[PDB]
Amino acid sequence: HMSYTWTGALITPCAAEESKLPINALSNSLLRHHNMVYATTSRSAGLRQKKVTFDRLQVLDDHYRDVLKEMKAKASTVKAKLLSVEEACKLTPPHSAKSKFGYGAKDVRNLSSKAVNHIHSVWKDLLEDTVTPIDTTIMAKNEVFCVQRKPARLIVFPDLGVRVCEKMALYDVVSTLPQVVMGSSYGFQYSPGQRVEFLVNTWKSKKNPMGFSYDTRCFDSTVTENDIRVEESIYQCCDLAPEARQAIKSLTERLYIGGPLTNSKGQNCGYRRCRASGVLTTSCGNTLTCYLKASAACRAAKLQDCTMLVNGDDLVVICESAGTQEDAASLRVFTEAMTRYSAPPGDPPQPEYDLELITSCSSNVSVAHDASGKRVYYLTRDPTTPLARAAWETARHTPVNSWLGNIIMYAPTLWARMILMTHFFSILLAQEQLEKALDCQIYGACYSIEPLDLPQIIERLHGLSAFSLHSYSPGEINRVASCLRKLGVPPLRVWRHRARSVRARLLSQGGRAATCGKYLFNWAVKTKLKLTPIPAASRLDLSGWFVAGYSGGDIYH
């Protein structure tokens, strides 16, 4: 029962790979310690292969089957529809990997004849053949970190023609089913404002709260054939067209359960019997399987008044404390149960009695004060990786702009406002590119976003208080200051000074640019404008935001 078998062929790059931080004239204004930042490359793929390759053992008890029965009962209330070829085509990212069969992502989006023709042949084949393993490409992801060096993560995906077919069969299912089955525990339904409120209200709902995050070592590799057949049984509980059932069975047997791995040169690298990281059902599958195992493990452990929050493989549990000793015992049982279910821990779980000390979806709750002095909770994180990536994106154009996703998701934080907003608007001013739409990724989906829309986007996700926060916590101030020292980033007093300049320049231009100056940089000026609700921030179409997760799912909105 091995996650992978290997031939010995190497995982190969598609193009040249830089590992050292590229430097330009803008670099030093963000960060001086350039040797701290690196990107992963295929050169480390072998170490990752070793990490992700292990034997899985699975022992399944009555708690597991009881939870599954209840999930299936909820799944049976879902009705999902087939997407048409063109609906599915318009969900494809413009810079998605081209097909091996002589067509690309733009041909798919234009509904060109050769793309549409091939897609129909793949669909027909899915319907006739439920046995032949489908080919996947395996690649090393190039991602940017700060030192303490990780090996490249691996992405496994099928051909573009198959991906469009997955959308036809499954897009409506993976978008709709998770919230029906998990209700309030499904994380991807929440904007950042709604996530913080949920965590705080849950913490507050317990007489004596205790919470913990659970880190599964290599979740994707822990997913067994059983787990993936179990997901399919859940999907099949939905009210589906007969053609959708046949396609889902087929993709399950031929793709989701496993298949051969091919490098960028077309050589055979080996074989997969675990979760593929680049299929449509990666996020929904991981979410269902994480929630199933964790729910069953909560019962095994006898945790009292358990509330879970689940985003794929990321899990937080908040419950009633039974004292520090019985809590420690409960968590050992939880971890033994997950372990028997094929989800052993990386870092073993710790009981926490302070909400601010729990990290989940790479983020912790912290507290600041708005214009009225009233306390507001908001989500933050250690800004090291966000700033290392902004350093890279200062000297190189990248298809996805992490600085922009980070401003969107962490708008209330002191580091996003002072450093990220200041640095990148100054860059957009100097190049006259304020009006140019940029791509970023939120909950695995790709979005085209106009930066001049940032203030409306932020008021909607966070509320106006995001533009007025002050008096941040000492732990948060210390973590930021600590990151600025490590990376060699200029002090917050230098950023305030630049932000005054950026602000005044934005005000000069009027329109949406002036509104950015006013809302985004109100913190920079000695005596503040009283900010009021933005007119445009009621007209933005944020539908298709905070519905579901789509990690590796090749989704564009």
Ligand X SMILES: CS(=O)(=O)Nc1ccc2c(c1)S(=O)(=O)C=C(c1c(O)c3cc(F)ccc3n(Cc3ccc(F)cc3)c1=O)N2
Q: Which amino acid is at 295?
A: S
Q: Smaller CB distance to ligand X: residue 11 or 445? A: 445
Please, are residues 380 and 364 in contact by the beta-carbon 8 Å criterion? yes
- Give the number of other Cβ atoms within 10 Å of residue 20's Cβ: 10
The distance from CA 114 to its chain's CA centroid, rounded to whole angstroms, is 33
Write down the residue that tokens 């934005």 correspond to: 506
Q: Residue 443 CB, nearest distance to ligand X (Å)?
A: 4
Selected from 22, 94, 351, 444, the binder of ligand X by CB under 6 A is 444
Selected from 406, 426, 515, 522, the binder of ligand X by CB under 6 A is 406
Of the CA atoms within 13 Å of residue 186, those in its CB half-sphere come to 25
Considering only residues 343 to 362 of the shown chain, the ones binding ligand X according to CB under 6 A are 361-362
Please choose which of ligand X, Ni ion, none residue 312 contacts, taking the beta carbon within 5 to 8 angstroms, the exact cut-off set by kind.
ligand X
3-class SS of residue 411: coil
Selected from 21, 257, 358, 409, the binder of ligand X by CB under 6 A is 409
Q: What's the rounded Cα separation, in Å, for the pair 390 and 372?
A: 33
Write down the residue that tokens 């060699």 correspond to: 488
Q: Residue 222 CB, nearest distance to Ni ion (Å)?
A: 24
> How many residues belong to the site for ligand X (CB under 6 A)?
22
Q: What share of the chain is helix, strand, coil (3-state, %, to 5)?
A: 50, 15, 35
Of 42, 31, 365, residue with least CA distance to 192: 365
Q: Residue 299 CB, nearest distance to Ni ion (Å)?
A: 8
**Lookup: tokens for 168:** 């036809």
Please tell me whether residue 465 binds ligand X under the rule CB under 6 A: no
Please, are residues 547 and 188 in contact by the beta-carbon 8 Å criterion? yes
Please tell me whether residue 70 binds Ni ion under the rule CB under 5 A: no
What DSSP letter does each residue of 500-545 carry, written as one string?
HHHHHHHHHT-HHHHHHHHHHTGGGSSS-------SGGGT---TTS
Selected from 61, 66, 86, 239, the binder of Ni ion by CB under 5 A is 66
Instruction: Give the residue numbers of the binding site.
Output: 215, 313-314
Q: What are the CA-CA distances from residue 536 to residues 201, 439, 457, 460 (Å)?
A: 30, 21, 10, 11
What DSSP letter does each residue of 204-264 carry, written as one string?
HTSSSEEEEEE-BTTHHHH--HHHHHHHHHHHTTSB--HHHHHHHHHHIIIIIS-EEEE-T
Helices (H) and strands (E) in the chain, counts: 21, 14
Q: Residue 207 CB, nearest distance to ligand X (Å)?
A: 27
Please choose which of ligand X, Ni ion, none residue 335 contacts, taking the beta carbon within 5 to 8 angstroms, the exact cut-off set by kind.
none
Q: Smaller CB distance to ligand X: residue 310 or 337? A: 310
Considering only residues 304 to 323 of the shown chain, the ones binding ligand X according to CB under 6 A are 311-314
Please choose which of ligand X, Ni ion, none residue 161 contacts, taking the beta carbon within 5 to 8 angstroms, the exact cut-off set by kind.
none
Of 174, 312, 282, 291, residue with least CA distance to 238: 174
Phi, psi of 364 (to 5 degrees): -125, 150
Please tell me whether residue 443 binds ligand X under the rule CB under 6 A: yes
Q: Residue 268 CB, nearest distance to ligand X (Å)?
A: 26
Enumerate residues 6+ apart whose C-beta is below 8 A from 416. Answer: 383, 386, 406, 407, 410
Please choose which of ligand X, Ni ion, none residue 66 contacts, taking the beta carbon within 5 to 8 angstroms, the exact cut-off set by kind.
Ni ion
Q: Smaller CB distance to Ni ion: residue 64 or 495? A: 64
Site track for Ni ion across 266-305, x = CB under 5 A:
----------------------------------------
Q: Which stretch binds ligand X (CB under 6 A): 95-103, 262-270, 279-287, 525-533?
A: 279-287
Please tell me whether residue 421 binds ligand X under the rule CB under 6 A: no
Please choose which of Ni ion, ligand X, none residue 279 contacts, taking the beta carbon within 5 to 8 angstroms, the exact cut-off set by kind.
none
Please tell me whether residue 151 binds ligand X under the rule CB under 6 A: no
Selected from 28, 47, 50, 62, the binder of Ni ion by CB under 5 A is 62
Instruction: Give the residue numbers of the binding site for Mg(2+).
Output: 215, 313-314
13's enclosing H/E stretch is none
Please tell me whether residue 192 binds ligand X under the rule CB under 6 A: yes
Please, are residues 401 and 33 in contact by the beta-carbon 8 Å criterion? no
Write down the residue that tokens 């509104």 correspond to: 515
Please tell me whether residue 415 binds ligand X under the rule CB under 6 A: no
Q: Residue 112 CB, nearest distance to ligand X (Å)?
A: 30
Instruction: Report the residue number whose CB is nearest to Ni ion.
Output: 66
Please tell me whether residue 549 binds ligand X under the rule CB under 6 A: yes
Of 335, 341, 295, 336, residue with least CA distance to 319: 295
Please choose which of Ni ion, ligand X, none residue 283 contacts, taking the beta carbon within 5 to 8 angstroms, the exact cut-off set by kind.
ligand X
Residues in contact with ligand X by the rule CB under 6 A: 192, 195, 282-283, 286, 311-314, 361-363, 379, 405-406, 409, 441-444, 549, 551
Residues in contact with Ni ion by the rule CB under 5 A: 62, 66
